[PDB]
Design a protein around this ligand. Structure first.
Ligand SMILES: [Zn+2]
Ligand SMILES: [Zn+2]
Ligand SMILES: [Zn+2]
Ligand SMILES: [Zn+2]
Ligand SMILES: [Zn+2]
Ligand SMILES: [Zn+2]
Ligand SMILES: [Zn+2]
Lengths: 221, 217
């Protein structure tokens, strides 16, 4: 079974260095070449570079003077170094193997899961969570939409869980946006209106990065 | 320095119909060895890219024959027949022959469905936020189609543009609709000096806007 697995720092300051290791499983680095590809938030894929099974490298035109790609064959690991980081370098970084084991790849075979790299000068900040509850002035019927507003955190991401997962029943997760240097997202859940406020509804907000879990009971008024 | 340009950017297609994606290179891609190295990748929402077609026209293992690629020297097409729900995502042409390898800009495959009006709900600021100094009024527009939609924020019947943030979901895989969230952020002091807050959603399902509001009282 062929596997690729990237480990990265997560967050890095905007002039420091980035170093990502991709460990390889199920095939040897003396047989195949390895591509690094990146994707900035909401943008298309960019080819970053390649290290060939030989040991030689090629870099993307735009990034070629900041990039170095090395490799330890014995350890099954591939390294990407990147100097003088820009805010632009914020991306998910993937490694991929060539399916052609010879100097002309037919394509990129298997891919890693990718690793998020965030480049800034903001600091780990737990999120503020605020409940989103109907005004006592507009009673609907069949069903009720409730929300949680998750504001002022860093870095990405959070996960909002509703009632221990008991509700995937129309959860909508709105992608985070950047606000005053920090992220904000919101999540909504729709439930039968005979079960709220009758029965308890909670949103649980995990922010692994700061090690915080925040719960908010959703209550009328 | 070898630019691949994909069209269209976003391709609406009915479930079971045929989808057709094209890629053009700024320069002919053919190696004087007759060979031509063009591959098509698919990236499903939240997933790693995966190889569909590898030498203009070759299917990668496990890829159903309803996916086909063709093209000459600068002109290439991916064709998807009988489009299923699994087919949704962004398609990328890729060229590796010529150094450096380069992707096209991607084409989002969107599932066409019947128009659907949003369910809108406005939410006043929580008191715990008010305590903090801020006040965000929130509007959810859930489960609509198509994606274009206009949110207009009103404060005592006056339009407000400053401090609005909007966020769309990707297309739902089950019902094929979009949802979006609009947030108006004011200071507590700003917020407390007005009575009404109004969310207005204009959407092709109606010439009438859908309006939700509350009074602070
Ligand atoms: Zn390569
Ligand atoms: Zn394989
Ligand atoms: Zn050649
Ligand atoms: Zn067949
Ligand atoms: Zn060339
Ligand atoms: Zn939905
Ligand atoms: Zn006023």
């Amino acid at each position: 079974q062929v596997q690729l697995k990237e480990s990265g720092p997560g967050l890095v300051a905007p002039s420091q260095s980035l170093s990502i290791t991709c460990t390889v499983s199920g095939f040897s680095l003396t047989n195949y070449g390895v591509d690094w590809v990146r994707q900035p938030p909401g943008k298309g894929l960019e080819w970053v570079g390649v290290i060939w099974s030989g040991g030689s490298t090629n870099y993307n035109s735009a990034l070629m003077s900041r990039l170095s790609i090395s490799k330890d064959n014995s350890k099954s690991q591939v390294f990407l170094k990147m100097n003088s980081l820009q805010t632009d370098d914020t991306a998910v970084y993937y490694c991929a193997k060539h399916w052609g084991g010879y100097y002309i790849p037919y394509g990129m075979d298997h891919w890693g899961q990718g690793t998020t790299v965030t480049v800034s000068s903001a600091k780990t900040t737990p999120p503020s969570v605020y409940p989103l509850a109907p005004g006592c002035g507009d009673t609907t019927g069949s069903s009720v939409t409730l929300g949680c507003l998750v504001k002022g955190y860093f870095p990405e991401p959070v996960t909002v869980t509703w009632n221990s997962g008991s509700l995937s029943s129309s959860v909508h997760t709105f992608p985070a946006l950047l606000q005053s240097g920090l992220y904000t997202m919101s999540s909504s859940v729709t439930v039968p209106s005979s079960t709220w406020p009758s029965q308890t509804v909670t949103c649980s907000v995990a922010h692994p990065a700061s090690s915080t879990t925040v719960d908010k009971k959703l209550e009328p008024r | 320095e070898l630019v691949m340009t994909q069209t269209p950017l976003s391709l609406p297609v009915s479930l079971g119909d045929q989808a057709s994606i094209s890629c053009r290179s700024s320069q002919s891609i053919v190696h004087s060895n007759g060979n031509t190295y063009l591959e098509w990748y698919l990236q499903k929402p939240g997933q790693s890219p995966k190889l569909l077609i590898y030498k203009v026209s070759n299917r990668f293992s496990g890829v159903p024959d309803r996916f086909s690629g063709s093209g000459s020297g600068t002109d290439f097409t991916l064709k998807i027949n009988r489009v299923e729900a699994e087919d949704l995502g962004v398609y990328y042409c890729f060229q590796g022959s010529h150094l450096p390898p380069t992707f096209g800009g991607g084409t989002k495959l969107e599932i066409k469905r019947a128009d659907a009006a949003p369910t809108v709900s406005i939410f006043p600021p929580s008191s715990e936020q008010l305590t903090s100094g801020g006040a965000s009024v929130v509007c959810f527009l859930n489960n609509f189609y198509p994606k274009d939609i206009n949110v207009k924020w009103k404060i005592d019947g006056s339009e407000r543009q400053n401090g609005v943030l909007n966020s769309w979901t990707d297309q739902d895989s089950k019902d094929s609709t979009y949802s979006m969230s609009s947030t108006l952020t004011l200071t507590k002091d700003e917020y407390e000096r007005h009575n009404s807050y109004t969310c207005e959603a204009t959407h092709k399902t109606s010439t009438s806007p859908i309006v939700k509001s509350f009074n602070r009282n």
